[PDB]
């Protein structure tokens, strides 16, 4: 629901929902029109 | 203690950093720690 969701609040007041409890999904985030920019600041991205 | 280094746990850079910039940190946390040593290498010969 977060990556096609259809639209976002705006980058004044931003969406924030809680992805808690669960198992990562990052092994289906691979398939898809995928990202203008995928990035990590604080960890190596192959860590998720 | 961090010496200066984004954390002073020394694998928990390496999970955040890709090795060339860790190279740069660990750095100040040998740095740091060596010296450290050699303060307390010191500390020990003067009371030995």
Known sequence: ?48 | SNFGAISSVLNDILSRLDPPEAEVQIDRLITGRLQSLQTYVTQQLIRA
Do not use: H, M, Q
Request: charged share 15%.
């Open chain 1, 1 to 48: 629901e977060v990556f096609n969701a259809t639209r976002f609040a705006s980058v004044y007041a931003w969406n924030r929902k809680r992805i808690s409890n669960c198992v990562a999904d990052y092994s289906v985030l691979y398939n898809s029109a995928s990202f203008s920019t995928f990035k990590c600041y604080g960890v190596s991205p192959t860590k998720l």
